[PDB]
């Protein structure tokens, strides 16, 4: 019995997708509802839109864009070409917005149901779809990300803590460089790190939720996972005690590093995936490592939250679409009998109303 459940959802090559177009610059997955792939067929560029609820009937349309990202919840697509941004509602067959930036947008993504984040060489912007809203500058980029490949951008629930991540080669390894920005303080901090997420967590005894920042890093000395409260606690709350724990890489994976993180607020667990397809599960409250294993031969290059199970969904270089979530009937007995940690098993059983700690 394992504490997690692995599932294959689709094989993209079986829907006529060219394997050469299955990668980070051409395939986007902004949520679990859609996958978008840019393909060139003859002289004509096209977008293929896969509805994950009806995947055998994809729409293919002509485009002239360098990047396409679908809204997390609706058939509303954003397209760009250099500095030119355009937004379309597909069901309404209409152009809803257009904007031309001063600088080329090098990376973008949806950070909520109605807001797109834009990254240029110099700065980060947020653009709301409400009313006649225009892009608003959030902060200037820090010099420590200069020349990095930008791989991610994330925020907390309230959009008060913002996090930009890039990577590059230094001393024959992949080094991550993050910029954490506080909107209320108007201050940045540079941090060495590879993958991260924010989460809301209500501690025993507190009236208000804590906002936590979790990040994983493979540094010059080994892997580490940090879980730390950002800002001063909501009035009347105890502060969350910070945790720092090891992240294991085997001796034969000397070049591997963290590429993705998703946190389940249903189970209060952190899912970590590495470039070469290793999956780790940690407890959010303590940082205790619950499980690790290799689950993809091919590299995983994009992930999202998997709504139905509160797990993680992703796509590998072969075009396998896969998910991992907590196995609710097994996790508590596993922790008790295989990890031999009755304290953690009892805590998780009562905290998240899971069955299995009636006999320890």
């Amino acid at each position: 019995i394992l504490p997690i459940r692995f599932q294959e959802h689709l094989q993209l090559q079986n829907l006529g997708i060219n394997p050469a177009n299955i990668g980070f610059s051409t395939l986007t997955m902004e949520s679990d509802k859609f996958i978008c792939i840019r393909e060139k067929v003859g002289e004509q560029a096209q977008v293929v839109i896969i509805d994950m609820n009806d995947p055998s009937n994809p729409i293919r349309r002509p485009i002239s864009a360098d990047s396409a990202i679908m809204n997390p919840a609706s058939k509303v697509i954003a397209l760009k070409a250099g500095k030119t941004l355009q937004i379309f509602n597909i069901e309404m067959k209409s152009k809803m917005k257009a904007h031309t930036m001063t600088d080329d947008v090098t990376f973008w993504k949806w950070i909520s149901l109605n807001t797109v984040a834009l990254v240029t060489d110099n700065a980060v912007y947020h653009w709301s779809m409400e009313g006649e809203s225009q892009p608003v500058k959030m902060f200037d980029r820090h010099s420590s990300l200069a020349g990095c490949q930008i791989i991610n951008y994330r925020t907390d629930a309230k959009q008060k803590w913002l996090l930009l991540t890039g990577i590059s080669a230094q001393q024959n390894r992949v080094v991550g460089a993050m910029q954490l920005y506080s909107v209320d303080r108007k201050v940045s901090q540079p941090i060495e790190g590879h993958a991260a997420s924010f989460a809301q967590f209500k501690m025993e005894g507190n009236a208000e939720e804590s906002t936590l920042f979790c990040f994983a890093v493979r540094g010059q000395a080994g892997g580490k996972l940090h879980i730390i409260e950002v800002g001063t606690p909501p009035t009347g709350n105890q502060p969350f005690p910070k945790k720092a724990v090891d992240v294991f890489f085997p001796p034969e994976a000397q070049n591997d590093f963290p590429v993705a993180m998703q946190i389940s607020e249903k189970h209060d667990v952190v899912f970590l995936i590495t470039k070469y397809g290793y999956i780790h599960l940690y407890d959010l409250e303590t940082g205790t490592c619950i499980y690790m294993n290799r689950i993809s031969g091919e590299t995983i290059f994009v992930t999202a939250p998997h709504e139905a199970t509160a797990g993680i969904i992703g796509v590998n270089r072969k075009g396998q679409v896969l998910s991992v979530c907590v196995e609710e009937e097994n996790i508590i007995p596993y922790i008790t009998n295989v990890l031999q940690n009755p304290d953690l098993a009892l805590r998780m059983a009562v905290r998240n109303n899971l069955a299995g700690a009636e006999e320890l």
Binding site: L180, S182, R185, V187, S188, Q189, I191, F213, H226, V230
Partner: peptide
């Protein structure tokens, strides 16, 4: 660090 002490 300004924002966080790691």
């Amino acid at each position: 660090g300004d924002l966080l002490n790691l």
